[PDB]
From a paper:
Light-driven oxidation of water to molecular oxygen is catalyzed by the oxygen-evolving complex (OEC) in Photosystem II (PS II). This multi-electron, multi-proton catalysis requires the transport of two water molecules to and four protons from the OEC. The OEC consists of a heteronuclear Mn4CaO5 cluster, which cycles through five intermediate S-states (S0 to S4) that correspond to the abstraction of four successive electrons from the OEC via a redox-active tyrosine residue (Yz). During one cycle of the catalytic reaction, the OEC consumes two water molecules; one is introduced into the cycle during the S2 → S3 transition and the second during the S3 → S0 transition.
A high-resolution 1.89 Å structure obtained by averaging all the S states and refining the data of various time points during the S2 to S3 transition has provided better visualization of the potential pathways for substrate water insertion and proton release. A high-resolution dataset was generated by merging more than one hundred thousand high-quality diffraction images collected at RT from PS II crystals in various illumination states and a structure was refined to a resolution of 1.89 Å. In this high-resolution structure, the waters in the O1 channel have higher B-factor values than waters within the O4 and Cl1 channels. The average B-factor values for the waters up to approximately 15 Å from the OEC in the O1 channel, O4 channel, and the Cl1 channel are around 38, 31, and 27 Å2 respectively. The waters with a high B-factor in the O1 channel are distributed through the entire channel, starting from the bulk waters (lumen side) to the waters close to the OEC. On the other hand, the waters within the Cl1 have high B-factor values only near the bulk at the lumen side (~33 Å2 on average). Furthermore, several Fo-Fc (difference density map) peaks in the high-resolution dataset likely imply partial occupancy of highly mobile waters in the channels. In the O1 channel, the Fo-Fc peaks are distributed through the entire channel, starting from the bulk waters (lumen side) to the waters close to O1 of the OEC. By contrast, the Fo-Fc peaks in the Cl1 and O4 channels appear only near the bulk water on the lumen side. The combined 1.89 Å high-resolution structure of PS II in this study helped model partially occupied waters in the crystal structures of the individual timepoint data.
Residue numbers in the entry:
A (entry chain I): 1 to 36
B (entry chain C): 32 to 473
C (entry chain D): 12 to 352
D (entry chain E): 3 to 84
E (entry chain V): 1 to 137
F (entry chain F): 12 to 45
G (entry chain A): 11 to 344
Write the structure that this text describes.
C-alpha cells in the first residue's frame, strides 16, 4: 500500500507541476491577436 | 462605451471618482456594522441565550471579551452600545469623503498629485498601494493580539469552570505548530485551519500573520515585480479585481466551514452548538437518561449489532453510537472530561457525569442548527411553536452564497480581463477571424 | 361585402392585441380559467371536499392556497353550475368543487383557442406553423394529467389541485403510490426537459461568446440590426470550439434550431404517455426479479428496495388525511416505522 | 411600429389620466376591502368563518359523501352550527 | 367552535375546585410556554425524555398529582421525578434553579398560573395531538 | 387624434379593475383575527 | 527548438483534434481515473456498508442489479468526512466493503469537471472568442459540487452524498424532501422555473427560427440543406419571426435584437440552476424549506389542515422509514 501511496504522490506532483509551470510559461501571449 | 447597467465600469480610469465609490461603499459597510449592532442591542434580552435571539454581531464582540463573564453570561451591555455607536458615527465621515470624492472632488487624481494618482499598468505604483494595505492589515492582526495580551484578553470557551475571559500570556510561536495547521488535511479528524482549538494558537497565528503582512508590505513598497511575474499576469484594473474576487471567494468558503465546525473562536455559548455538537449531545442525553434507569450502556447491543450507546471508530476510539458515529471528531468543553486515552471512558461515564454536563447536552440537542426559512426550529416535519434558526446556519448559508457568487464574478472578470487585454472582448473581427486562418481539424 | 367577410376584416385588424376568429374561443376561456383560479384561491375553501383551508380569506398564503378538486363522491361529474349537484346555487357550487371543473374545462378550451391563434397568426403573417406544433406538447401534458389521469381513477378528487403546495402533494403522491420516478416514460420526460434547458443555456452562451465585433461599444447588444442579412455570430468558430472541447458540434443552423424544438417537445409527449398508463394504475412499480430474490434472501438490499420502503411510509402516513372519504383509521401499532423515528 | 392606440407612457404621465385614476384605483381598493370587512365574502362563497369549521364538541370533518344529496348534506352540516 | 369559558375551566387543585381562565390568560400562557418550555415540550411531548408527556392523564398519575393548577405551579417551583421521590431542579427549569435556567428569572406568580392553564387547556382543544407526537401531526 | 376606448383599453381594464379590488380584499384579510 | 517550449506548444495547440491545454493536463488523468473506476465498480463492486451499520447495499450488476437499480454506493457513515484512499485500507477487500471507490470517483470527477470548466475558458482565449461559456457551465458544475461535496460536508458524512446510480438518485431526492422540505424552498422553486422555463424557451426559440426558415429547397429534400456551414447570410427571417411572435402576444413582448434574445436564453436557465445549486448547498446547513405545519388554526385552536400539512404527512412517512435500522435516538439531527 505504501508503494501505491508513493506512486500516486509522485504522479500527482508531476501533473500539478506541469500545470503550474505551463501557466507560468508566458500564457497571456498564447492567443491569436496581441502577444505581450 | 458601457451601458447604464454596466455603469460603474465607466470609473475604471477616473481615479478620483473611483476613490469616492470605494470610500462611500466603505461607509455603507461601517454603517451596517453600527446600525445592526444597535438593532441587536435594542432587541437583546440578557436572560435568553444569544442564539435564541437572532444575533450575529453581539457574539463577535462577546468573543473578544467585552460584555461577558464566566460561562458567557452577559454582565455589561455598554461595550456593545459603544461598538455600534462608534461604527455608526464613523460611517458619516466615510460617507462624507465618499460623496465629496465621487461628485465634487477631482475626477482624476493623477493631475492633483503624483502620489495619490495611479495608472493600473504601473506595476511599481500598484505594488506600493498593495504594500501599504498589507501594512495596515498587519497592524490589524496585531490589534487582536494586543486585545488578547494587554487589554483584557478574549473569551475562552475552554477555560476551566464553564468558560471565561482570559488574558493570553503565552501565545504559540512555534512555527511547527502555527504552520502545521496550514499543512493538515482538510478532511475529517484533521480539518485544516478550522481545527484550531485553543486561544494560544489563535493569538500566535496573528503575531505571525501581522509580522508576515508588515514584512511583505515593506517588500512590495520597495520592489517591482520580477520578470517571471510580469509575464504570468494580466496588468489591468479588471484583472486586479478578478484576482481579489477569487481570493474573497476562497475566504468566504473557509469562513463558512469555520462557523459550521469551530466552537473555539465561535463559542457555542454565543453561536449555539455546531451540527456535530448537537448530534453528539443527543446521544449523551439518552445515554444519561437510560443509565439513570439502570441500563448498562457499555454492554448494550443495538439492533444492528453495534452498540446502542457506545461503539468504536474505525481506529478503535470509543465513541457515541447511532448515526452520530459520523461526528466522533467533535471536541467540546462539556464532553472532554469524559474522554480517556482510548476515547470515551466507561468508568467516567458511569461515575462522573455532572448536572452541568446533563444540562448542556439537553440544551444543545434542543438547539441543533436545523430550522425552516421562516424560522421554525427543528427538523422539517416539526410543527410550528419554536421560533429558532441557529446563527451558525444563518452565517454558513449566507457566506456560502456570497462565496459562490464571487467565484462566478472571478470567472466573469478574469475571462473578460484576458479577452480585453488581447483585444477581442467585443467580438471577432470579421476580416481577421482566427479560425478562418487555421487548418481544418479533419 | 358579405357580413361574414366584414367580421373577418374586423377580427383580423392589426391592433395592440390581435383578436382573430380564434380570439372568440381563447379570450373568454383564458380569462375565465384565470379568474376562476384567482377567485377561488382568494375566497374559496376546500373544507367540504377535502377538509382543507385553501384561500387567502382563510389564512393561507401564496404557497398553500389552491382551487382544490371536488369530493371523491362527485365521481367524474361535469359539476355544471346548473347541474343536478349544485342545482344553480352558486355558493354550494363553490363548496362542492365546481370551480375545479370550471377552470379545467375552460382551461382546456382556452388551450385549444391558443393553439388555433398560433395557427391563425402564422397563416396571416406567412410563416410556417412550427410554434403551434411545438405547443402540442403542453397540451398533451395538460390533458393527460388534468383530464385523462382522473378519468381512469375513481373521480376528479385525485387529479391535481390548482395550487403550489397542492401540486407538491401531487408529486409526492405519485412517488409513494405509482413509483413514478421508476417509469421510463417519466425518465424520457426528464431528459427532454433537462436536455432542453441545457440546449437553451449552451446555445445562448455560444452565440453570445462567438459574436462578431460589429460596433465599438463594450455593450455588444447595440451592434445588431434586425434587418442586417449577415449572421451576427460565427458558426465557424462556434463549431471549432465545440468540436475541440466536446468532440462533436453542430454545423447546420437549421438542424440546430429544429433539434431545440424536438428535444423538449418529445420529452413532454413521452411523459404524457406514462401518465396515461398511471390513469389505469399501469405503473412501472416493481422489478419482479428483484422481489423474488429479496423475499428469499434477507441479506439482499438495493436502492430499489430501499425506495419501496419509503413509498410504503408515504402511503400509510399520508393516506388517512389525503383521502378523507375512505375513513382510514390506522392505529399507531400498524404504521410502518424504522427504529427510533 | 405602431397600431394607432395611444402610447402607454404618454397616458400614465398625463394629467387627465391621474385625475381619473386617483379616484378609481382607491375606490376599487376600498370596495374590495369592504367586500371582506363586511363579511360579505364569507356568505357569497360559503367559506367558513374562524368559528364555523367545527361544532363546539366536534373534530369530524363535514365531508360531502353523496353526489346528488351533496347540496343537502352541506346544508345539514351548516344547521349543526346554528 | 370557539374558546368558551367551559374549555377555559380547569382544575385548580386535587379537591375539585375549578378556575376559569380568561382568553387573555390562555394566550399569555401559550406565549410563555413557547418562551420557556417548547424547546423541549413542543406539542406536549418531552424531546429529552419522550416517555413522559404533558397529557392530562399522564399528569394525573404523577406523584404529587400535576393535573391541576396548584400541582403545576409547584412543579415549576420545585420539580420532582414522576414518583415524587427526587427533586430535579438542577436538570429541569424551575424558580428554584433560575440561577442556572435564566429564562425562569423574570417569571411572576401570575405567569406561572398562565403557563399551567395553557398546559391544562390545550388537550381540551387538540385532543390526541397534545402529547401524541408526530403520529398526529 | 388618439381614440380613448379601444380593444386594448378593454383588455387592460378587464384585468386591472378586479386586480385592485382583489388587492383591497386581500389587504383587509391581514387584520382578520381568529 | 527547446524541449519544454515544444511541449508547451503542443499542449496549447489549436490544431489538436481535441484541445488539451493546461487545464487538460489535470482533467485527462482525473477523468480517466474516475471513469475507469466507475465502470468497474458499477459492473463488479461487492456490496457497500453505506450507513455504517454493517448492512451492506448491493450496487453492482454482477451482484443482482440492473441498469436502473445499480449504483456505486457512497462510502460508510463510519468514515464520515475522513479521507479514505486505497492506501489507508488494510486491503482492497476492506476498501470495497467500506465504499472506497465512491470517494475515488467523486474526487477525481469534481477535479476533472472543474478543469473542464477552465478548459472551456482556455480554448476560447486561444481562438479569440469571448470568454463566458465557462460561466454557463458553472451552473451544472455547482450543482454537482452541491450533491457530491457540499451536502456531505454540511451533514458530516459522504454517506449522505448522492449515490452514483439511477435509483440511488431517487433515494437521495426522497430523503432530502423528508429532511429539508426542498419543495417548499424558494431556491428549488427557482430551479424548477429555470429548467421548465429553459425547456419552454428552447422549444420557443427552436420553433420560431424553424417557422421562419427562408425557402431554399424543394418539398423532396430536407430543408436543412438550405443552410451551408459558414455561409454569411442568416438562414431565417428574424423580422418575420418577430412579426409572428409579437402578434401572438403583443409587440413589446417579442425580441427583435438577436443578441438580447440569445443572452436571455443563456441567462434564464443558468441563473435558475445557480439558485437550485445554492438551494442544496444551503440546505446542507439545514436552512430548510418553509414550514407552514399547523399554521392555520380556528377560533377555538383546532388545527385546520392546508395542503402544507398534507405534504408534511408524506414527509413523515419518508422520515420514519429511511435508513430504518440506523437511528437509536428520537431526532434525526443529521
Ligand atoms: C489555489 C486555488 C485553490 C485550489 C486548491 C485546491 C486544494 C484542494 C481543496 C480541498 C477541498 C476540501 C474538501 C473537504 C472539505 C471539508 O471537509 O471541509 C471541512 C473542513 C473542516 O473539517 C472539519 O474540521 C473539524 C474541526 O473541528 C474540530 O475542532 C474544532 C475546534 O473548535 C471543534 O472542536 C470540532 O468539534 C472538532 O471536530 C473536524 O476536524 C471535522 O472532522 C472536519 O470535517 O473545512 C476546511 O478544511 C476548510 C476549507 C474547505 C473549503 C470547502 C471547499 C468548498 C468548495 C467550493 C466549491 C464550489 C465550487 C463552485 C464550482 C462552480
Ligand atoms: C455602493 C454603490 C455605488 C456607488 C458607491 C456608486 C458610485 C458612482 N457611480 Mg455607480 N451604480 C450603482 C452603484 C454605485 N455607484 C448601481 C447599483 C448602478 C445601477 C443603476 C450604478 C450605475 C451607474 C451609472 C450608470 C453611472 C454610475 C456612476 C457613478 C459615479 C458618479 C455618479 C454621479 O455623479 O451621480 C450624480 C448623482 C447625483 C448628483 C444624485 C445624488 C447622489 C448622492 C451621492 C446621494 C447621496 C445620498 C446620501 C444620503 C448623502 C450623505 C451625505 C453625508 C455623508 C454628508 C460614482 C462614483 C457614473 C459614472 O461612472 O460617471 C462617469 C455613471 O455614469 N453608476
Ligand atoms: C450577510 C449576512 C447576514 C446574515 C447572516 C443575517 C442573518 C440574520 N439577520 Mg440580518 N441583516 C443583514 C445581513 C445578514 N443578516 C443585512 C444586510 C441587513 C440589512 C437589510 C440585515 C437586517 C436585519 C434585520 C432588520 C433583522 C435581521 C435578522 C436576522 C436573523 C433572521 C434572518 C431572517 O429571517 O431572514 C429571512 C430570510 C430572507 C429574507 C431571505 C433572503 C433571500 C435573499 C433575498 C436572496 C438574495 C440572493 C443574493 C444575495 C438572522 C440571524 C432579524 C433578527 O432576528 O434580528 C435580531 C431582523 O429583525 N437582519
Ligand atoms: C483611503 C481613503 C482616502 C484617500 C486615498 C483620499 C485621498 C485624497 N483626498 Mg480624501 N477623504 C477621505 C478618504 C480618502 N481620501 C475621507 C474619509 C474623507 C472625509 C473626512 C476625505 C475628505 C477629503 C477632503 C475634504 C479633501 C480630500 C482630498 C484628498 C487628496 C489629498 C489628501 C491630503 O493632502 O491629505 C494629506 C494627509 C493628511 C491630511 C493626514 C490625515 C491623517 C488621517 C486623517 C489619519 C488616518 C485615519 C485613520 C485610518 C482612522 C482611524 C479609525 C478611527 C475611526 C477610530 C487625496 C487625493 C482633498 C482633495 O482632493 O482636494 C482636491 C480635499 O480637499 N479628502
Ligand atoms: C494580498 C496579499 C498579497 C498579494 C496580492 C501579493 C502579490 C504579489 N506578490 Mg507578494 N507577498 C505578500 C502578500 C501579497 N503579495 C506577503 C505578505 C509577502 C511576505 C511573505 C509577500 C512576499 C512576496 C515575495 C517574496 C514575492 C512576492 C511577489 C508577488 C507578485 C507575484 C505573486 C505570485 O506569483 O503569486 C502566485 C503564487 C505562486 C506562483 C506560488 C504559490 C505558493 C503557494 C503557497 C501554494 C499554495 C496553493 C494552495 C492551493 C493554497 C493553500 C495554501 C497552503 C500554503 C496551505 C504579486 C505582485 C513576487 C514578486 O514579483 O515580488 C516583487 C515575489 O517574488 N510577494
Ligand atoms: C468587489 C466586487 C465587485 C466589483 C467591484 C465589480 C465591479 C464591476 N462589475 Mg462585477 N460582479 C461581481 C463582483 C464585483 N463586480 C460578482 C460577485 C459577480 C457575479 C454575480 C459579478 C458579475 C458581473 C457581470 C455579469 C458584469 C459585471 C460588470 C461589472 C462592472 C460594472 C458593474 C455595474 O455597473 O453594476 C451595476 C449594478 C447593477 C445593474 C445592479 C445589479 C443588481 C443585482 C444583480 C441584484 C442585487 C439584489 C440583492 C441580491 C438583494 C435583493 C434581495 C431582495 C430585495 C429580493 C464593474 C467593473 C459588468 C462588466 O463586465 O463590466 C466590465 C458585467 O457585465 N459584474
Ligand atoms: C368561448 C366561450 C365559452 C366556452 C366555450 C365555454 C365553455 C363552457 N362553459 Mg363557460 N362561460 C362563458 C364562455 C364560454 N364557456 C362566458 C362568457 C361566461 C360568462 C357568462 C361563462 C360562464 C360559465 C359558467 C358559469 C359555467 C360555464 C360552463 C361551461 C361548460 C359547459 C357549457 C355548456 O354546457 O354549454 C351548453 C350550451 C351550449 C353548448 C350552447 C349551444 C347553442 C345551441 C345549439 C342553440 C340553442 C337554440 C335555441 C335555444 C333555440 C331558439 C328558439 C327560441 C324561439 C326559443 C363549458 C366548459 C359551466 C362549467 O364550467 O361547468 C363546470 C358553468 O357552470 N360557463
Ligand atoms: C428540556 C431542557 C426541558 C425544558 C426546557 C422544560 N422541560 Fe419540562 N421536562 C423535561 C424533562 C427531561 C422532564 C422529565 C423529568 C423527569 O425525569 O421526570 C420534564 C418533565 C416535565 C413535567 C412533568 C411531566 C409529567 O409528569 O408527565 C412538566 C409538567 C414539565 N416538564 C413542565 C415544564 C414547563 C412548564 C416548562 C417551561 C417552564 C418546562 N417543562 C421546560 C424537560 C424540559
Ligand atoms: C456616490 C453615489 C451613490 C452612493 C452613495 C453612498 C453609498 C453614500 C454613503 C453615505 C453614508 C455612508 C452616509 C452615512 C451617514 C451617517 C450618519 C449621518 C450618521 C448619523 C448618526 C447619528 C446622528 C447618531 C445618532 C445616535 C447616537 C449618536 C447614539 C445612539 C442613538 C442615535 C442612533 C440616534 C449612489 C449609489 C446612491 C448614487 C450615485 C452616487
Ligand atoms: C492567523 C491564524 C493562524 C495562522 C495562519 C497563517 C499563518 C496562514 C498563512 C496562510 C498563507 C501562507 C496562505 C498562502 C496562500 C497562497 C495561495 C492562496 C496562492 C495561490 C496561488 C495562485 C492563485 C497561483 C496561480 C497561478 C498559477 C498557479 C500559475 C501561474 C498563474 C497564476 C499566478 C495565476 C492559525 C491557523 C495558526 C491559527 C488561527 C489564526
Ligand atoms: C370565477 C367565476 C366567474 C368569473 C370571475 C372572474 C373572471 C374573476 C376575475 C378575477 C381577477 C381578474 C382577479 C385578479 C386578481 C389579481 C391579484 C390578486 C393580483 C395580485 C398580484 C400581486 C400580489 C403581485 C405582486 C407582485 C410581486 C409579488 C412581485 C412583482 C411585483 C408585483 C406587484 C406584481 C364568473 C363571474 C363568470 C361566474 C362564475 C365564477
Ligand atoms: C358555450 C358558452 C356557454 C356559456 C355558459 C354561460 C352559463 C351561464 C349560466 C348561469 C345560469 C345558472 C342557472 C341555474 C338554474 C338551475 C335550475 C335547475 O338546476 O333546475
Ligand atoms: Cl441515532
Amino acid at each position: 500500500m505504501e508503494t501505491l501511496k508513493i506512486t500516486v504522490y509522485i504522479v500527482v506532483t508531476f501533473f500539478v507541476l506541469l500545470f503550474v509551470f505551463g501557466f507560468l510559461s508566458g500564457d497571456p501571449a498564447r492567443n491569436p491577436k496581441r502577444k505581450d | 462605451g458601457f451601458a447604464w447597467w454596466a455603469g460603474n465600469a465607466r470609473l475604471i480610469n477616473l481615479s478620483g471618482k473611483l476613490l469616492g465609490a470605494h470610500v462611500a461603499h466603505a461607509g455603507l459597510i461601517v454603517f451596517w456594522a453600527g446600525a445592526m449592532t444597535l438593532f441587536e442591542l435594542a432587541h437583546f434580552i440578557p436572560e435568553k441565550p444569544m442564539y435564541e435571539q437572532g444575533l450575529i454581531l453581539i457574539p463577535h464582540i462577546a468573543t473578544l471579551g467585552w460584555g461577558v463573564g464566566p460561562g458567557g453570561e452577559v454582565v455589561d451591555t455598554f461595550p456593545f452600545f459603544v461598538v455600534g455607536v462608534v461604527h455608526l458615527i464613523s460611517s458619516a465621515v466615510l460617507g462624507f469623503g465618499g460623496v465629496y470624492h465621487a461628485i465634487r472632488g477631482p475626477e482624476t487624481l493623477e493631475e492633483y498629485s503624483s502620489f495619490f494618482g495611479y495608472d493600473w499598468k504601473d506595476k511599481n505604483k500598484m505594488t506600493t498601494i498593495l504594500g501599504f494595505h498589507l501594512i495596515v492589515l498587519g497592524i490589524g492582526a496585531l490589534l487582536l493580539v494586543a486585545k488578547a495580551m494587554f487589554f483584557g484578553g478574549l473569551y475562552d470557551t475552554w477555560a476551566p469552570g464553564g468558560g471565561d475571559v482570559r488574558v493570553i500570556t503565552n501565545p504559540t510561536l512555534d512555527p511547527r505548530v502555527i504552520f502545521g495547521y496550514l499543512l493538515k488535511s482538510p478532511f475529517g479528524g484533521e480539518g485544516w485551519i478550522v481545527s484550531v482549538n485553543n486561544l494560544e494558537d489563535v493569538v500566535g497565528g496573528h503575531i505571525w500573520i501581522g509580522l508576515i503582512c508588515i514584512a511583505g508590505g515593506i517588500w512590495h513598497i520597495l520592489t517591482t515585480p520580477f520578470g517571471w511575474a510580469r509575464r504570468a499576469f494580466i496588468w489591468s484594473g479588471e484583472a486586479y479585481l478578478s484576482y481579489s474576487l477569487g481570493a474573497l471567494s476562497m475566504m468566504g468558503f473557509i469562513a463558512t466551514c469555520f462557523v459550521w465546525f469551530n466552537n473555539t473562536v465561535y463559542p457555542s455559548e454565543f453561536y449555539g452548538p455546531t451540527g456535530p455538537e448537537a448530534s453528539q449531545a443527543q446521544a449523551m442525553t439518552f445515554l444519561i437518561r437510560d443509565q439513570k434507569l439502570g441500563a448498562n450502556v457499555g454492554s448494550a447491543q443495538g439492533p444492528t449489532g453495534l452498540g446502542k450507546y457506545l461503539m468504536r471508530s474505525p481506529t478503535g476510539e470509543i465513541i457515541f453510537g447511532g448515526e452520530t458515529m459520523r461526528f466522533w471528531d467533535f471536541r467540546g468543553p462539556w464532553l472532554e472530561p469524559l474522554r480517556g486515552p482510548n476515547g470515551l471512558d466507561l468508568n467516567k461515564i458511569k461515575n462522573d457525569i455532572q448536572p452541568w454536563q446533563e444540562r448542556r447536552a439537553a440544551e444543545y440537542m434542543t438547539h441543533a442548527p436545523l430550522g425552516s426559512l421562516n424560522s421554525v426550529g427543528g427538523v422539517a416535519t416539526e410543527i410550528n411553536s419554536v421560533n429558532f434558526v441557529s446563527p451558525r446556519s444563518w452565517l454558513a448559508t449566507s457566506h456560502f452564497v456570497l462565496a459562490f457568487f464571487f467565484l462566478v464574478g472571478h470567472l466573469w472578470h478574469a475571462g473578460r480581463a484576458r479577452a480585453a487585454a488581447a483585444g477581442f472582448e467585443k467580438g471577432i473581427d470579421r476580416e481577421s477571424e482566427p479560425v478562418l486562418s487555421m487548418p481544418s481539424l479533419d | 361585402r358579405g357580413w361574414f367577410d366584414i367580421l373577418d376584416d374586423w377580427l383580423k385588424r392589426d391592433r395592440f392585441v390581435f383578436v382573430g376568429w380564434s380570439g372568440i374561443l381563447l379570450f373568454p376561456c383564458a380569462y375565465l380559467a384565470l379568474g376562476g383560479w384567482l377567485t377561488g384561491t382568494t375566497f374559496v375553501t376546500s373544507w367540504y371536499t377535502h377538509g382543507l383551508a385553501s384561500s387567502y380569506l382563510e389564512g393561507c398564503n401564496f404557497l398553500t392556497v389552491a382551487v382544490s378538486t371536488p369530493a371523491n363522491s362527485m365521481g367524474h361529474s361535469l359539476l355544471l353550475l346548473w347541474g343536478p349537484e349544485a342545482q344553480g346555487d352558486f355558493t354550494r357550487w363553490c363548496q362542492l368543487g365546481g370551480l375545479w371543473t370550471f377552470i379545467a374545462l375552460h382551461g382546456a378550451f382556452g388551450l385549444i383557442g391558443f393553439m388555433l391563434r398560433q395557427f391563425e397568426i402564422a397563416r396571416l403573417v406567412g410563416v410556417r406553423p412550427y410554434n403551434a406544433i411545438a405547443f402540442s406538447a403542453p397540451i398533451a401534458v395538460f390533458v393527460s394529467v388534468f383530464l385523462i389521469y382522473p378519468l381512469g381513477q375513481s373521480s376528479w378528487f385525485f387529479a391535481p389541485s390548482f395550487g403550489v403546495a397542492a401540486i407538491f402533494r401531487f408529486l409526492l403522491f405519485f412517488q409513494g403510490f405509482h413509483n413514478w420516478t421508476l417509469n421510463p416514460f417519466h425518465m424520457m420526460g426528464v431528459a427532454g426537459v433537462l436536455g432542453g434547458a441545457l440546449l437553451c443555456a449552451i446555445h445562448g452562451a455560444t452565440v453570445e461568446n462567438t459574436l462578431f465585433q460589429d460596433g465599438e461599444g463594450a455593450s455588444t447588444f447595440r451592434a445588431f440590426n434586425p434587418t442586417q442579412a449577415e449572421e451576427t455570430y460565427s458558426m465557424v468558430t462556434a463549431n471549432r470550439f465545440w468540436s475541440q472541447i466536446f468532440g462533436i458540434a453542430f454545423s447546420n443552423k437549421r438542424w440546430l434550431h429544429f433539434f431545440m424544438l424536438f428535444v423538449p417537445v418529445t420529452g413532454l409527449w413521452m411523459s404524457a404517455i406514462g401518465v396515461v398508463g398511471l390513469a389505469l394504475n399501469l405503473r412501472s412499480y416493481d422489478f419482479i426479479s428483484q422481489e423474488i430474490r429479496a423475499a428469499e434472501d434477507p441479506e439482499f438490499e438495493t436502492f430499489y428496495t430501499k425506495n419501496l420502503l419509503l413509498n410504503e411510509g408515504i402511503r400509510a402516513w399520508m393516506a388517512p388525511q389525503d383521502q378523507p372519504h375512505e375513513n382510514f383509521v390506522f392505529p399507531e401499532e400498524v404504521l410502518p416505522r424504522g427504529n427510533a423515528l | 411600429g405602431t397600431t394607432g392606440e395611444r402610447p402607454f407612457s404618454d397616458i400614465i404621465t398625463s394629467v387627465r389620466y391621474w385625475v381619473i385614476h386617483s379616484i378609481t384605483i382607491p375606490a376599487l381598493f376600498i370596495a374590495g376591502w369592504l367586500f371582506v370587512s363586511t363579511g360579505l365574502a364569507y356568505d357569497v362563497f360559503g367559506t367558513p368563518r374562524p368559528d364555523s369549521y367545527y361544532a363546539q364538541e366536534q373534530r369530524s370533518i363535514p365531508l360531502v359523501t353523496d353526489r346528488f344529496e351533496a347540496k343537502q348534506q352541506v346544508e345539514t352540516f351548516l344547521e349543526q352550527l346554528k | 367552535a370557539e374558546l368558551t369559558p367551559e374549555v377555559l375551566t380547569v382544575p385548580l387543585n386535587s379537591e375539585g375546585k375549578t378556575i376559569t381562565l380568561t382568553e387573555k390568560q390562555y394566550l399569555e400562557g401559550k406565549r410563555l410556554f413557547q418562551y420557556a418550555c417548547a424547546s423541549c415540550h413542543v406539542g406536549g411531548i418531552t424531546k429529552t425524555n419522550p416517555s413522559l408527556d404533558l397529557r392530562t392523564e399522564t399528569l394525573a398519575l404523577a406523584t404529587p398529582p400535576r393535573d391541576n393548577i396548584e400541582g403545576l405551579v409547584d412543579y415549576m417551583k420545585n420539580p420532582t421525578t414522576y414518583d415524587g421521590e427526587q427533586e430535579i431542579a438542577e436538570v429541569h427549569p424551575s424558580l428554584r434553579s433560575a440561577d442556572i435556567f435564566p429564562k425562569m428569572r423574570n417569571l411572576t406568580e401570575k405567569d406561572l398560573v398562565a403557563i399551567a392553564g395553557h398546559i391544562l387547556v390545550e388537550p381540551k382543544i387538540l385532543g390526541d395531538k397534545w402529547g401524541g407526537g408526530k403520529v398526529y401531526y | 387624434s388618439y381614440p380613448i376606448f379601444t380593444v386594448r383599453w378593454v383588455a387592460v381594464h378587464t384585468l386591472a379593475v378586479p386586480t385592485i379590488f382583489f388587492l383591497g380584499a386581500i389587504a383587509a384579510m391581514q387584520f382578520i383575527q381568529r | 527548438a527547446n524541449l519544454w517550449e515544444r511541449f508547451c506548444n503542443w499542449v496549447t495547440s489549436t490544431d489538436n483534434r481535441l484541445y488539451v491545454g493546461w487545464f487538460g493536463v489535470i482533467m485527462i488523468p482525473t477523468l480517466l481515473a474516475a471513469t475507469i473506476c466507475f465502470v468497474i465498480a458499477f459492473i463488479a463492486a461487492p456490496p457497500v456498508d453505506i450507513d455504517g451499520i454493517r448492512e451492506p447495499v448491493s450496487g453492482s450488476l454482477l451482484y443482482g442489479n440492473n441498469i436502473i437499480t445499480g449504483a456505486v454506493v457512497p462510502s460508510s457513515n463510519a468514515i464520515g468526512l475522513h479521507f479514505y484512499p486505497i492506501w489507508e485500507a488494510a486491503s482492497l477487500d476492506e476498501w470495497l466493503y467500506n465504499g472506497g471507490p465512491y470517494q475515488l470517483i467523486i474526487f477525481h470527477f469534481l477535479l476533472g469537471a472543474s478543469c473542464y470548466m477552465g478548459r472551456q475558458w482556455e480554448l476560447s482565449y486561444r481562438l479569440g472568442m469571448r470568454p463566458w461559456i465557462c460561466v454557463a457551465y458553472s451552473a451544472p458544475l455547482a450543482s454537482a459540487f452541491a450533491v457530491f461535496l457540499i451536502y456531505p460536508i454540511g451533514q458530516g458524512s459522504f454517506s449522505d452524498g448522492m449515490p452514483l446510480g439511477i435509483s440511488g438518485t431517487f433515494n437521495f431526492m426522497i430523503v432530502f424532501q423528508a429532511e429539508h422540505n426542498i419543495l417548499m424552498h424558494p431556491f428549488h422553486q427557482l430551479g424548477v422555473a429555470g429548467v421548465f422555463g429553459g425547456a419552454l424557451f428552447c422549444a420557443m426559440h427552436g420553433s420560431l427560427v424553424t417557422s421562419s426558415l427562408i425557402r431554399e429547397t424543394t418539398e423532396t429534400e430536407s430543408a436543412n440543406y438550405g443552410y451551408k456551414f459558414g455561409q454569411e447570410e442568416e438562414t431565417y427571417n428574424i423580422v418575420a419571426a418577430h412579426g409572428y411572435f409579437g402578434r401572438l402576444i403583443f409587440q413589446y413582448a417579442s425580441f427583435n435584437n438577436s443578441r438580447s434574445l440569445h443572452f436571455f436564453l443563456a441567462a434564464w436557465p443558468v441563473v435558475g440552476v445557480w439558485f437550485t445549486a445554492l438551494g442544496i448547498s444551503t440546505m446542507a446547513f439545514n436552512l430548510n424549506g418553509f414550514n407552514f405545519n399547523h399554521s392555520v388554526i380556528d377560533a377555538k385552536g383546532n388545527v385546520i389542515n392546508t395542503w402544507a400539512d398534507i405534504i408534511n404527512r408524506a414527509n413523515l412517512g419518508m422520515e420514519v422509514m429511511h435508513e430504518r435500522n440506523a437511528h437509536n435516538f428520537p431526532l434525526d439531527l443529521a
